[PDB]
């Protein structure tokens, strides 16, 4: 069958009650299963006979048949929730998947708390110099990150990451790692790291020499 | 505990062959229903292949039927998955699960399997000859063989029947990762005026063939 | 006529997995003594391993013996060669050839087995906490990872007994080929005086461990 | 054994007496195989059992056994003999390999006939320009190569390839290409190839527009 995942993504704070549809185009075959699949892991398993609640899977998750729209329910999200399911069909050796349904626990908005790392004197001494800027435990995920050196505005030479969301506080992190060379890095004294978050901007920031 | 590891992947180009490997331990693989899950990066999950305890009786996607084999191995307790005629959508990350009750109990950590930088007909360019360039009565032409991927090209000159003073360069690998070389042969300068010269040029990976034929530079 | 056909080359990184075929026509392969042989590009000649007719003794040589296998297949008619544990000496253009007499009669086009950019153990770096950091009563620390390859790095702190605050940022690929990432953790402002923060990488690729201490920034 | 194949290169012209000599550390099966690898093809067997000629191999190749010092003959050298030979014992499953002895065919030096190539009205309309220049049957193999621009020296943007010595002729061949944008191609006038061998330089040139 075509297993029809709806929809193909949500947001829900912690405590919500949380639906995924799963609709099999032509089927009678109960067997229907739920998976996880946390974020760079394996898909966990979950509900299996689109009833039956595996061993080890907490009490929230419960599984349900509307004759073809196979349905997944998590009574109380909690924010260890966040992940992407699918759905999963066994016909005669016919095992086919949902599109997925990703979901991101939202969260009341929060900005960040900003640190700025200038270069250790031992990477100083290789000849590279980075600099990296963290944007602590914030929310949304989005966000505008700007390196300034002397007041000159870089650009290409920052690679920034961003944390999975936080399976407490449901909050993101963010460090721009500013990459340059020992000479460049001699050769200016401010350097600076901005964020903008809606209306909001701050930017940390030290001086070469100042202890 | 019930573990599966997997192993054998990398990078092939399209085509190739890889045999992905799948142990497993805490439990005898000959006595369950194995399959094989592949996921593109930034994408869902799509069924690859399965087979049967004993019985080994092989399912596969229709998508890989007549390009990818399952087989297993009691002795080593380990399934295999043979991927051969790989293309652009094979690149996934892929897992070896093992059927328990009406799903899949136990998964691995998953192997990635890559495909090249895609295969890429040649660019034919006429090397064109000159009253400048020709020296006495010999005049030199040619025609180039620039941007391709993967190799070879077979380049040829007038059916074949050109063969002496034919030189065909070896391959270089330009900075943009295409491969390229050129072809030329020296021609009497009289023949310009009356013999057509065609370069035959084909490309089995992209199942191409060119034939351009060099003519006169002009304005 | 009698021809040995070559497959199942690409690219790999240490270790890895890869399984070189050799189909043959025009003879029985289960009745003759079948080699492989290497030529590391721009290199001389090394023997691999051999397999007997029938019989089914195989020879290796003492370079691989561990890490490759061979083995025939009759049913398909076709030789194989299993290479695990694989290094950067391993790189090489890989032929199947045919015992003759009392030498090596028929010879295959040679599939190539590359390895990838080798091994890297990664650099440790203190993301150094400060005054000018500290906010309130919350400072923060961290110690980088940089040029490591291929993945991953384990990154826990204080043996792992700092769990709460701890941020291990994913890996990112940097323009020299490199993989690099940081942990950082928030700390009390007090507890810089006392308490003191190592990092502990793993690199099992490498099989090197860092610890490093991130410690107060000074001049 | 360890095949220790003597010299590990070497340079004759063309119907000189050539010599490759092999020696195994400490044997005696007299089972010892030679080999020729022409430029990116398979090993051919040429002969076994160190005396006999393997079906399809030219007389000129001859094998002998110095009890220890295998020695391959070939009495009148040919241009097409030009190649890369190895030894090979096979002792209790030990198939060891010599170190390997190159063969060039030496010949009266002699300069190439350079032609220069514009690049094509086609390769224009696509935005690169590759100018591409020929050397042709030349004696020995090294050679200087140098583009110039409106008299400009040109550095990093050409790639030159070399044929295999010539089956025939027992010369050479060689093909610079350089690459340029086509806003740069535009820009300039005169184009030039310096070839330098030895004592001699020789300039093929074009200008844009010349017909």
């Known amino acids: 069958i075509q297993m029809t995942q709806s929809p193909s993504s949500l947001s829900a704070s912690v405590g919500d009650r949380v639906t995924i549809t799963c609709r099999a185009s032509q089927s009678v075959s109960s067997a229907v299963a739920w998976y996880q699949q946390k974020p760079g892991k394996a898909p966990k398993l979950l509900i299996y006979?689109?009833?039956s609640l595996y061993s080890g899977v907490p009490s929230r998750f419960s599984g349900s048949r509307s004759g073809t729209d196979f349905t997944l329910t998590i009574s109380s999200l909690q924010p260890e929730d966040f992940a992407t399911y699918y759905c999963?069909?066994?016909?005669?050796?016919?095992?086919?998947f949902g599109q997925g349904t990703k979901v991101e626990i939202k969260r009341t908005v929060a900005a960040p708390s900003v640190f700025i790392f200038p270069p250790s004197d031992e990477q100083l001494k290789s000849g590279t110099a980075s600099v990296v800027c963290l944007l602590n435990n914030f929310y949304p995920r989005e966000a505008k990150v700007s390196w300034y050196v002397d007041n000159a505005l870089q650009s290409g030479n920052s690679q920034e990451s961003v944390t999975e969301q936080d399976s407490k506080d449901s909050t993101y992190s963010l460090s721009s790692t500013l990459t340059l060379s020992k000479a460049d890095y001699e050769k200016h004294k401010v350097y600076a790291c901005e964020v903008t978050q809606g209306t909001t901007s701050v930017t940390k920031s030290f001086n070469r020499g100042e202890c | 505990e019930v573990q599966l590891v997997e192993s054998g992947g990398g990078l092939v180009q399209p085509g190739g062959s890889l045999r992905l490997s799948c142990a497993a331990s805490?439990?005898?693989?000959?006595?369950?229903?194995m399959h094989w899950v592949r996921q593109a990066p930034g994408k869902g999950l799509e069924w690859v292949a399965s087979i049967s305890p004993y019985y080994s009786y092989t399912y596969y996607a229709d998508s890989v039927k007549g390009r990818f084999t399952i087989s297993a191995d009691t002795s080593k307790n380990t399934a295999y998955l043979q991927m051969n005629s790989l293309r652009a959508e094979d690149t996934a990350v892929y897992y070896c699960?093992?059927?328990?009750?009406?799903?899949?109990?136990?998964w691995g950590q998953g192997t990635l399997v890559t495909v090249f930088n895609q295969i890429k007909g040649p660019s034919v360019f006429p090397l064109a000859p000159s009253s400048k360039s020709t020296s006495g009565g010999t005049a030199a032409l040619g025609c180039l063989v620039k941007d391709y991927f993967p190799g070879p090209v077979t380049v040829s000159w007038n059916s074949g029947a050109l063969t002496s003073g034919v030189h065909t360069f070896p391959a270089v690998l330009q900075s943009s990762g295409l491969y390229s070389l050129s072809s030329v042969v020296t021609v009497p300068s009289s023949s310009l005026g009356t013999q057509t010269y065609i370069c035959n040029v084909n490309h089995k990976p992209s199942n191409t063939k060119v034939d351009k034929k060099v003519e006169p530079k002009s304005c | 006529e009698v021809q040995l056909v070559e497959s199942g080359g690409g690219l790999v990184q240490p270790g890895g997995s890869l399984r070189l075929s050799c189909?043959?026509?025009?003879?029985?392969?289960?009745?003759?003594?079948?080699?492989?042989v290497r030529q590391a590009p721009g290199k001389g000649l090394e023997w691999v391993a051999s397999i007997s007719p029938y019989y089914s003794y195989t020879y290796y040589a003492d370079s691989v013996k561990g890490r490759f296998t061979i083995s025939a297949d009759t049913s398909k008619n076709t030789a194989y060669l299993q290479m695990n544990s694989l290094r950067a000496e391993d790189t090489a253009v890989?032929?199947?050839?045919?015992?003759?007499?009392?030498?090596?009669?028929?010879?295959?086009?040679g599939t190539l087995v590359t390895v990838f950019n080798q091994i890297k153990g990664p650099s440790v770096f203190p993301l150094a906490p400060s005054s000018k950091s500290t906010s309130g009563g919350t400072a923060a620390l961290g110690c980088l990872v940089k040029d490591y390859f291929p993945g991953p790095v384990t990154v826990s702190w204080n043996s792992g007994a700092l769990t709460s605050g701890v941020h291990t940022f994913p890996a990112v690929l940097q323009s020299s080929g490199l993989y690099s990432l940081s942990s950082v953790v928030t700390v009390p402002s007090s507890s810089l005086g006392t308490q003191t923060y190592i990092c502990n990488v793993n690199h099992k690729p490498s099989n090197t461990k860092v610890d490093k201490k991130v410690e107060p920034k000074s001049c | 054994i360890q095949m220790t194949q003597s010299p590990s290169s070497l340079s004759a012209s063309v119907g000189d007496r050539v010599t490759i000599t092999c020696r195994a550390s400490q044997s005696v099966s007299s089972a010892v195989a030679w080999y020729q690898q022409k430029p990116g093809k398979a090993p051919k067997l040429?002969?076994?059992?160190?005396?006999?000629?393997?079906s399809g191999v030219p007389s000129r190749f001859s094998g002998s056994r110095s009890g220890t010092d295998f020695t391959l003959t070939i009495s009148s050298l040919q241009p097409e003999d030009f190649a890369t030979?190895?030894?090979?014992?096979?002792?209790?499953?030990?198939?060891?390999?010599?170190?390997g002895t190159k063969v060039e065919i030496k010949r009266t030096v002699a300069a190439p006939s350079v032609f220069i190539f514009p690049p094509s009205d086609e390769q224009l309309k696509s935005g690169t320009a590759s100018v591409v220049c020929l050397l042709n049957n030349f004696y020995p193999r090294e050679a200087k190569v140098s583009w110039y621009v409106d008299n400009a020296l040109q550095s990093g943007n050409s790639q030159e390839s070399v044929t295999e010595q010539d089956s025939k002729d027992s010369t050479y061949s060689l093909s610079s290409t350089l690459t340029l944008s086509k806003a740069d191609y535009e820009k300039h006038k005169v184009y030039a190839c310096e070839v330098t061998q030895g004592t001699t330089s020789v300039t093929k040139s074009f200008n844009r527009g010349e017909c």
């Open positions: 699960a093992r059927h328990g009750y009406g799903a899949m109990d136990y």
């Open positions: 006979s689109a009833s």
């Open positions: 805490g439990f005898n693989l000959r006595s369950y229903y």
């Open positions: 999963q069909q066994s016909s005669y050796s016919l095992i086919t």
